[PDB]
Amino acid sequence: AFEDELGAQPPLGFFDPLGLVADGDQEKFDRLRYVEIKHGRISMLAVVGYLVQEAGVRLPGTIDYSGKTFAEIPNGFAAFKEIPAGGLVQLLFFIGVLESSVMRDLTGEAEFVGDFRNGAIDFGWDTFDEETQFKKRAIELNQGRAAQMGILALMVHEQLGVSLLP
Amino acid sequence: AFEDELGAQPPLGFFDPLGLVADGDQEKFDRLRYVEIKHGRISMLAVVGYLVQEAGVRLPGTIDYSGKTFAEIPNGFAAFKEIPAGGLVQLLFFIGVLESSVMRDLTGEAEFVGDFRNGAIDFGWDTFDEETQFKKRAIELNQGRAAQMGILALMVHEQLGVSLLP
Numbered sequence: 001a002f003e004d005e006l007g008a009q010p011p012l013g014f015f016d017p018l019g020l021v022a023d024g025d026q027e028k029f030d031r032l033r034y035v036e037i038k039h040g041r042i043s044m045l046a047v048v049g050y051l052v053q054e055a056g057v058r059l060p061g062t063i064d065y066s067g068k069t070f071a072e073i074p075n076g077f078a079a080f081k082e083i084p085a086g087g088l089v090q091l092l093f094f095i096g097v098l099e100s101s102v103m104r105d106l107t108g109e110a111e112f113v114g115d116f117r118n119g120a121i122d123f124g125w126d127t128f129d130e131e132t133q134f135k136k137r138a139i140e141l142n143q144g145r146a147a148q149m150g151i152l153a154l155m156v157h158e159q160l161g162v163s164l165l166p
Numbered sequence: 167a168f169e170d171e172l173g174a175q176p177p178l179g180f181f182d183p184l185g186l187v188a189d190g191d192q193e194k195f196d197r198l199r200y201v202e203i204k205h206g207r208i209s210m211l212a213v214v215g216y217l218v219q220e221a222g223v224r225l226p227g228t229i230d231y232s233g234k235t236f237a238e239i240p241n242g243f244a245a246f247k248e249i250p251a252g253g254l255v256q257l258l259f260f261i262g263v264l265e266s267s268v269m270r271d272l273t274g275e276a277e278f279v280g281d282f283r284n285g286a287i288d289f290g291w292d293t294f295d296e297e298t299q300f301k302k303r304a305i306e307l308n309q310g311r312a313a314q315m316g317i318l319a320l321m322v323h324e325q326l327g328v329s330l331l332p
């Protein structure tokens with residue numbers, strides 16, 4: 001059914017040990033694929049952010065008018081103890097607004113799930129041939145899969161207190 | 167242009183002292199009307215909630231597993247000092263999900279701005295005749311306008327420390 005879909009590749013081939021898409025429902029597959037791409041994009045950004053922040057890189061100066069500095073804010077979950085309440089509200093709200101109003105198929109012209117270009121932002125999708133376009137989608141998906149496991153590893157081991165970083 | 171639209175009624179008639187819709191742009195009017203209905207629905211719920219909560223009505227029992235009781239939580243802005251962080255996150259998140267996925271025209275079948283029935287929930291809109299339907303929309307809008315001023319009054323006077331309630 002979906003043995004030929006994007007994401008079935010060497011060395012495992014089509015890999016669905018829980019038969020989640022064995023029923024051949026295209027809409028179920030389309031949703032799960034949407035969810036898989038989304039977790040992957042978030043996790044790709046999350047691993048880079050965790051590593052950059054772990055290395056001590058900080059925005060210059062202060063995060064609020066009381067004089068709280070980005071430099072005082074630690075990496076990991078501990079960051080949330082030191083970001084001011086108003087900043088946490090804004091971060092959650094403005095990610096929510098991406099979810100409600102931006103990062104979605106607004107016009108119905110998406111070529112496949114995860115295509116949010118919306119006839120608005122495009123760096124040249126059609127300059128890739130069909131094989132290259134498929135390759136780029138596969139890289140996006142599989143980098144996303146690897147990063148999902150990577151960010152889970154970093155979050156878990158932060159709590160374990162067994163570091164995975166030099 | 168919009169002198170005959172919903173919301174222009176006695177005693178003021180069409181009332182736009184800032185000429186915001188003087189340009190006759192239907193899409194600008196449609197947006198502003200959408201925003202006016204939305205503030206009004208929120209404010210209608212807000213005034214009732216503030217008054218019910220001010221009267222001391224509380225949900226039974228505890229709001230978290232640490233034993234924090236609804237009864238310990240005060241009315242007004244002070245409530246946010248005592249709702250646990252996890253509850254504040256959930257409240258904001260689940261209102262955001264209403265915004266991203268529920269309280270909007272998902273199907274394009276809305277009869278006018280603010281119609282979120284979505285072919286899914288309808289208690290009998292078409293059992294009203296056209297005059298009654300217009301009357302009900304006018305009540306919804308003007309109750310919303312009154313409640314906007316009412317909730318602003320209550321929030322402002324809470325901070326003034328000059329109570330408007332017996």
Ligand code: CLA
Nearest residue numbers: 034035038039042092093095096099258259262263266267
């Ligand atoms: C207020 C902000 C906001 C809003 C309004 C939304 C709105 C939405 N998001 Mg988004 N999201 C946000 C912030 C927000 N998001 C943030 C900050 C992140 C992190 C960057 C994400 C990451 C995210 C992902 C990864 C996904 C969504 C999805 C969704 C949609 C479904 C939400 C749902 O059904 O409830 C949620 C319902 C639940 C039952 C919650 C599920 C909890 C998951 C399965 C496990 C989480 C584990 C937890 C974090 C750790 C446990 C603790 C541990 C000790 C055990 C909706 C469009 C989903 C989507 O698009 O579906 C098609 C989806 O897959 N969002």
Ligand code: CLA
Nearest residue numbers: 092093096097100101200201204205208258259261262265
């Ligand atoms: C994470 C949760 C979440 C998410 C994702 C959204 C998402 C959205 N909301 Mg919603 N909303 C939420 C929570 C959320 N809302 C909550 C909790 C409430 C209260 C119940 C509302 C009430 C609300 C209203 C009333 C309106 C929206 C609107 C919108 C849309 C536009 C948002 C925007 O452009 O940025 C916001 C951009 C800004 C520049 C912020 C404007 C700030 C306003 C003008 C003044 C606020 C004054 C402030 C509270 C008090 C000042 C302090 C004082 C001491 C001076 C978008 C669909 C708007 C909409 O549908 O537009 C068509 C709209 O009119 N929302």
Ligand code: CLA
Nearest residue numbers: 005006007008013014015016020032033035036039145148
């Ligand atoms: C939320 C994340 C998410 C989602 C929705 C999907 C969804 C999908 N994947 Mg994918 N995948 C993911 C993460 C995800 N994957 C990660 C992180 C990896 C790397 C390990 C992969 C690697 C992968 C391969 C190699 C293949 C798929 C395939 C598929 C498709 C069919 C199989 C299936 O149902 O999924 C998998 C299972 C689920 C979505 C069920 C969720 C798991 C439950 C709810 C909790 C389990 C938590 C788990 C124990 C965490 C520990 C990790 C483990 C290694 C110990 C479907 C579109 C196949 C495909 O593309 O077919 C065309 C395919 O060949 N996936």
Ligand code: CLA
Nearest residue numbers: 042045046048049052053057058059070073074075079121
């Ligand atoms: C999962 C992604 C993610 C999350 C949730 C966070 C969360 C956080 N970061 Mg981090 N960060 C990330 C990725 C992430 N970061 C990446 C990829 C980088 C490298 C550029 C950084 C670099 C960075 C620095 C240097 C600092 C933080 C800081 C912080 C904290 C305060 C908020 C802030 O200043 O943000 C700042 C956020 C950035 C500088 C980059 C965010 C990039 C986002 C994820 C882009 C993604 C969405 C985008 C709109 C997509 C547009 C597409 C387009 C086509 C329209 C907070 C814990 C500050 C702190 O206190 O650290 C402890 C701080 O000093 N971050």
Ligand code: CLA
Nearest residue numbers: 171172173174179180181182186198199201202205311314
């Ligand atoms: C966010 C709330 C909001 C929004 C978007 C609108 C939008 C609209 N109203 Mg409405 N209205 C509101 C709140 C709102 N109203 C409230 C609270 C009341 C009761 C006082 C009314 C009473 C009202 C009447 C009687 C009429 C309208 C009309 C209209 C339409 C054209 C006039 C206009 O541009 O609006 C008004 C102005 C604005 C949206 C600009 C915003 C104001 C700025 C940004 C800040 C001002 C803050 C202010 C000082 C707070 C103090 C309150 C004041 C009494 C001291 C338009 C659809 C007319 C109509 O329906 O035409 C068909 C009409 O006849 N409105």
Ligand code: CLA
Nearest residue numbers: 208211212214215218219223224225236239240241245287
């Ligand atoms: C603007 C609306 C609004 C807001 C933001 C709040 C916010 C709050 N309320 Mg209040 N409340 C409201 C309206 C509101 N309330 C109304 C209308 C009532 C009467 C039913 C109450 C009755 C009430 C009680 C009895 C208690 C609170 C409490 C609380 C606090 C903790 C959260 C909680 O337990 O919620 C509980 C919320 C409710 C019991 C009712 C919320 C009704 C919402 C607004 C319905 C609106 C959306 C809905 C999904 C629309 C569906 C449409 C459909 C066609 C699909 C928090 C400060 C608790 C607290 O600590 O107080 C200090 C508490 O004990 N509220």
Ligand SMILES: CC(=O)O[C@H]1CC(C)(C)C(=C=C/C(C)=C/C=C/C(C)=C/C=C/C=C(C)/C=C/C=C(\C)C(=O)C[C@@]23O[C@]2(C)C[C@@H](O)CC3(C)C)[C@](C)(O)C1
Nearest residue numbers: 044045047048123143144146147149150151153154164165
């Ligand atoms: C123009 C503008 O304004 O914006 C534009 C700019 C531009 C460029 C055009 C755009 C784009 C494309 C973007 C942003 C592409 C981003 C790509 C990105 C960010 C890709 C990350 C992959 C990470 C992986 C695979 C990690 C696996 C991690 C794994 C498997 C781990 O184990 C983690 C690890 O830690 C452990 C657990 C232990 C450590 O011992 C070792 C390591 C570190 C390995 C956008 C989207 O259009 C927006």
Ligand SMILES: CC(=O)O[C@H]1CC(C)(C)C(=C=C/C(C)=C/C=C/C(C)=C/C=C/C=C(C)/C=C/C=C(\C)C(=O)C[C@@]23O[C@]2(C)C[C@@H](O)CC3(C)C)[C@](C)(O)C1
Nearest residue numbers: 210211213214289309310312313315316317319320330331
């Ligand atoms: C089936 C289900 O599951 O749900 C369904 C149920 C049902 C019923 C079918 C549905 C509905 C309809 C609903 C929920 C309708 C709600 C209507 C509602 C809640 C209407 C409030 C008006 C408030 C106004 C005008 C306040 C002005 C307030 C003013 C002008 C003030 O000055 C405030 C005031 O405080 C001052 C400042 C000083 C005080 O001295 C005096 C007072 C108090 C006056 C939904 C939506 O379909 C959902």
Ligand SMILES: [Ca+2]
Nearest residue numbers: 067068069072
């Ligand atoms: Ca300091």
Ligand SMILES: [Ca+2]
Nearest residue numbers: 072073074082
């Ligand atoms: Ca610190």
Ligand SMILES: [Ca+2]
Nearest residue numbers: 233234235238
């Ligand atoms: Ca107690």
Ligand SMILES: [Ca+2]
Nearest residue numbers: 238239240248
């Ligand atoms: Ca208390």
